[PDB]
Amino acid sequence: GPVAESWCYTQIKVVKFSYMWTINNFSFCREEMGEVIKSSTFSSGANDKLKWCLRVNPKGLDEESKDYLSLYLLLVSCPKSEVRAKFKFSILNAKGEETKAMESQRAYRFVQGKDWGFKKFIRRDFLLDEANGLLPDDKLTLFCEVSVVQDSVNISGQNTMNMVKVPECRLADELGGLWENSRFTDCCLCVAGQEFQAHKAILAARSPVFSAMFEHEMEESKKNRVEINDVEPEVFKEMMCFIYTGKAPNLDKMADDLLAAADKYALERLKVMCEDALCSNLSVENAAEILILADLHSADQLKTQAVDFINYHASDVLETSGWKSMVVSHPHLVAEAYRSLASAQC
Amino acid sequence: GPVAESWCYTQIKVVKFSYMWTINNFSFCREEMGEVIKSSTFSSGANDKLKWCLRVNPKGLDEESKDYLSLYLLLVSCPKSEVRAKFKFSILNAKGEETKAMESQRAYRFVQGKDWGFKKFIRRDFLLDEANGLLPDDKLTLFCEVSVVQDSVNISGQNTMNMVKVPECRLADELGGLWENSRFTDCCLCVAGQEFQAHKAILAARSPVFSAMFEHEMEESKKNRVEINDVEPEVFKEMMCFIYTGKAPNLDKMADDLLAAADKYALERLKVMCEDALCSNLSVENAAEILILADLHSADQLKTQAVDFINYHASDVLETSGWKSMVVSHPHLVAEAYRSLASAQCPFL
Amino acid sequence: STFSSGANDKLKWCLRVNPKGLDEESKDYLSLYLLLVSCPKSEVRAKFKFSIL
């Protein structure tokens, strides 16, 4: 494999959907042949405009099948013209491994209203036998993998290729490296008795709350000293770093007070990144104060995710003294928890 | 144990009523064939508007079932049009165990006043024989269980979904938003008549040449009476747009002057952008002009591309009078070109 | 992608590969061709050698 004076890299983009679909009390299919059990529509993050659904016929779709289980995949919404894909089904057995896996070798085309699948997927007696355990506790578990192909793209790595090195846009690093130098700072800025020499122009540029506060009767007299006491300097310097550099790398260690400051300052990106930090840290012991901070900071998504956590761990989260304190102090949170866990779930 | 990007859960709602009938002195059946004995109507809490009852024929429904006691389930009251349900009748013996417990494979459809049941239920003699124990104390202890199925519902879960669906970025949008709002008017630079506003720190950071004379401890008079004449105000506005918005959509038709302003301003990035734009602009007729511009602007990459261009394109580029004009005006260019050709072509006479 | 070298650089070529057979007469084949898109002259004489890594 010698060195090539020109190379090209043809990239057919592929994205993968992964799907589980469980039917309870399957022996009560409750009807005869031809009937269909649609599944709820499902997708992935990108592009999320292509929505798929499952059609499963418990009895035979055709007179040739009859004693056969048949599944199809059906595409309900396509923003493009057509989408080419390969599907692979497999029944999960009692333990959970993939059995009876059947796939289509062809990348079938897909239009809205067009469905493809396996009519002769698995024999009805083979399913209804208990010895193979293909129907554990009358629960039918189907796992489908969907592979969607997109356009190929060529990056054209032929050499000599404008051989000067091109830096990216330098608004962020140039502004970030000016803070330690502390140049072009027209005014002073002290928080909690500690001096942080910065200036009001770029802060007014990069936070509309603060600029609207600046132009209204403070820059005339108290421009030089501004009273900030809602945060410690360790949170204030992190927020100033986020304002200038554009990122807050020290996130996990102080995600909570950074979220509180971001709720105070209506910084939605800071709020959602601290929420992303704290979502993985959901635990039984911390769920109550997590809910309290979410309610105080009006993070509806975090409130919903913590509600789901309480739904999944309701056996032990309730008896915690933290949740008891949340009960005694926050009746509304418990009322909303009851509403979500009652109306939505059951 | 595969991990699913999305999971679904469809549950068919099953409600089970339970019911026990005892008729004392059953051998005193009081009647012949054609007799119908009903029981009291019964239900559970959910949804409590579904009323069922039992109807037994002790002798038989018809002449085929004379030696078969017949038992029927009858749905008397239903709010909906159809109720699909599956029934299982059984008879409890003297100990109490289920005997002749026969089920329905189908979830039969029921309506107001429609009956479905087992006519061929149990032999009359097998019921009447005391040794079977199915008539303890002359009490016929029937026991039925009925399961009504409902429309299934889809829970429609989606693990990790779209997370929190974050809003637009603020890395360089806020620059543009502040410029659109046009607030904090720090200075008013009047150049070629039209007035432009900008700030100090961002201009100093992006343009070191602008920061150079402002680092000389004089700022206010130079801001009040700034002298800008080497670059026209349209290119100045385009530079402002490239700094704040971050894009230069019409750079192709203004590549030359933007490159000259970048040369004046020591903007290596902007000079590279204009050079890359001018790379896909070479034709057969103005390659001499492009090479002259690259040589004047000291654009090494563009000059190398043009030198390769002329060296391959030599069969037709030297035909135009621009090459002869370059020969007349710039003898040193012909000298270095001939030196490069002689150095490259070491072979041949 | 259309390719050349830095010299001479006006003869542009592109590989047209066919994952299936091009024709049914010789099916079960990866028919690969070299196609000249850009050329200034009337003809070009060239020898090509294909290979798979």
Task: Pick out its properties.
3 chains, alpha+beta, Potassium Channel Kv1.1, Chain A, 11 helices, part of a larger assembly, 11 strands, 346 residues, Apoptosis, Tumor Necrosis Factor Receptor Associated Protein 2, Chain A, five-stranded antiparallel β-sheet, four-stranded antiparallel β-sheet
User: Which chains make the largest contact?
Assistant: A-B, 59 and 56 residues
What CATH architecture of one domain in chain A do you see?
Sandwich
> How do the helices and strands follow one another from N- to C-terminus of chain A?
EEEEEEEEHEHEEHHHHHHHHH
Instruction: Write down how many β-strands of chain A occur, each being a DSSP E stretch of 2 or more residues.
Output: 11
CATH-level-4 superfamily name of one domain in chain A: Apoptosis, Tumor Necrosis Factor Receptor Associated Protein 2, Chain A
Largest sheet of chain A: 5 strands, antiparallel
Derived from helix and strand composition plus strand pairing, the structural class of chain A reads alpha+beta
Oligomer class: part of a larger assembly
Instruction: Output the CATH class name of one domain in chain A.
Output: Mainly Beta
Q: In angstroms, what is the radius of gyration of chain A?
A: 29 Å
CATH topology tier name of one domain in chain A: Apoptosis, Tumor Necrosis Factor Receptor Associated Protein 2, Chain A
Shape designation of chain A: flat
Q: Give the percentage of residues in beta strands of chain A.
A: 15-25%
| Total helical segments of chain A | 11
Helix content of chain A: 25-40%
- State the end-to-end distance of chain A: 63 Å
Pathway (chain A): Protein modification; protein ubiquitination
Protein name (chain A): Speckle-type POZ protein
InterPro entries (chain A): BACK_BPM_SPOP, BTB/POZ_dom, MATH/TRAF_dom, SKP1/BTB/POZ_sf, SPOP_C, TRAF-like
Subcellular location (chain A): Nucleus; Nucleus speckle; Cytoplasm
